Amino acid sequence: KVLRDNIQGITKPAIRRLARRGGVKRISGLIYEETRGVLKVFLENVIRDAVTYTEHAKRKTVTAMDVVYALKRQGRTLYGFGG
Amino acid sequence: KVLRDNIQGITKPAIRRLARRGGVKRISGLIYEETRGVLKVFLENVIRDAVTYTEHAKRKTVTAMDVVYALKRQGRTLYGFGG
Amino acid sequence: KPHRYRPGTVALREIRRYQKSTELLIRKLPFQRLVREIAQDFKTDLRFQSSAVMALQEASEAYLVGLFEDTNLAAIHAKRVTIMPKDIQLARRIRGE
Amino acid sequence: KPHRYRPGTVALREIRRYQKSTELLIRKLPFQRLVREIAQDFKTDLRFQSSAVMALQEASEAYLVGLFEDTNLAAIHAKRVTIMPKDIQLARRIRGE
Amino acid sequence: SGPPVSELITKAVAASKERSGVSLAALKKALAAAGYDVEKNNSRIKLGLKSLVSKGTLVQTKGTGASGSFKLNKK
């Protein structure tokens, strides 16, 4: 029921694709797991606030405008889902 | 009353002092005029904001209250001036 | 003879492709698994609107991509073409993360 | 022979001093004169509280110093000890300006 | 045409005779002063210097290969 490993669900080729979108052509092997940790850090940084909004709404299911709020708190305002 | 070249009034040893407070061990010779331009651009941004606040206050006297409004508006909030 | 491109040529070609493309580079379902895993660590039995998971996605690689142009500029700043994790540490520290 | 310190020794000493010190590092009167000079460019006959000028001096010095530590991070990241114009340009662009 | 680069290299190493050997950059500057288009002949000068190292005419002082300092034999 519980989950233990999904950080490896972000595969090395997916990271390679993102770096090609980032304009990176050559990637060290040390990159991938450290970037997994960094993005994971960003993930609880956003999802803690998202959960806080969700419980403060007296909802158990996470809704998208809560995510919109939590992303504009980090100076990372997202367009196309507000409202 | 009318002054022209006070960007050079921020003298080179003053820039060296700022760098040594910034932990800079060696400074290139090309650094100083660039930093003059950088501090320039930063300062007309913040004082353009300050001027806009002051004219909105129907004043010609610049207050530090307007200054701290301007600095927190650019996300560079300063403490210690009555805010 | 089986053709083989020299290194960087292909990588530049999908650089151009993914700069052209707008599609999402993450396997969606493992990402959703990771979201539910991490969110369960703070509150149990969390249920997700799929649009929220999607928005969390494009926010995530928005941050990741912008990090990669930052680190790529850092690497070419250091006169190198192969990226190092210390470049990522530098970018995070300069951004104030 | 007359005494002479080797380079960097006095530099490290004043680094320790100015990290220890808290005062403003630029002269008050030319800074106020420059502030009046550039504020005159937007609107004419502006009067200044000295507290406002000191706040500008303080915020400017802190902003410049933080940019300088970013420059230091770039320089040690570039395997150098001498700061360079491209370091400040990079740091400004990474910060987003 | 003229003579090959080997006479140029041995003239460059015999021109100075420092306690340390002459370096690659110093010998390239010496041949630029003497007159040679060294900008396209970097591979040519590298192969020539490595070949004359293998002859035993020159011994490399501190560097390895075409890097470092270069000094002539005992005799």
Added chain:
DNA sequence: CGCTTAAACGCACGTACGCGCTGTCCCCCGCGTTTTAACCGCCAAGGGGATTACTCCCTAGTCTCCAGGCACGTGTCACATATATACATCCTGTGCATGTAAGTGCATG
């Protein structure tokens, strides 16, 4: 829960990339010397920020009403995908110029 298929994965293998060594010029730095203007200290001017007073312009609020935009529904062509074709490009085979090495004939000791 079942089908499907491309993505991941992992292995092979070359190559280009960090990157350390060496060196080399030259760039700020420490150490003075000059010089200059920052600052303090003081003093005079006045002006506009702020404060009080008076006023009235405006706007939030209330009642009435109606139409503007939104939900819903429904045709419909823009374009995603598919298919066939052209060209850019990129590696790669090959041909050329140039440098170099070696043999050797010839003048000479």
Added chain:
DNA sequence: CATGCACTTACATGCACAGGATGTATATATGTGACACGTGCCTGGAGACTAGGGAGTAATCCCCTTGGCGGTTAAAACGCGGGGGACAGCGCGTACGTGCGTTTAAGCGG
């Protein structure tokens, strides 16, 4: 007769250019569903009136800001050797791009 030297000739190496491959670019086909538009509606915007209160404005004054001289150096500047540092070059050994078959798990769809 032997020998240095020059001359000539053969071979290795770096550079140029043609040539195919191929992945991308270029041309319709289509069928579809997203998109754009007709329609009920009601609620939210608007019209008339009111009351009252926030803001605009006069005065003033005084406090705070501006303007000015003169020591007073600290600081700014200037110069100069000279070490330390950016940086070019090279070798080199590697780790990662590239290619290809596999499994799986991502994805559809119900």
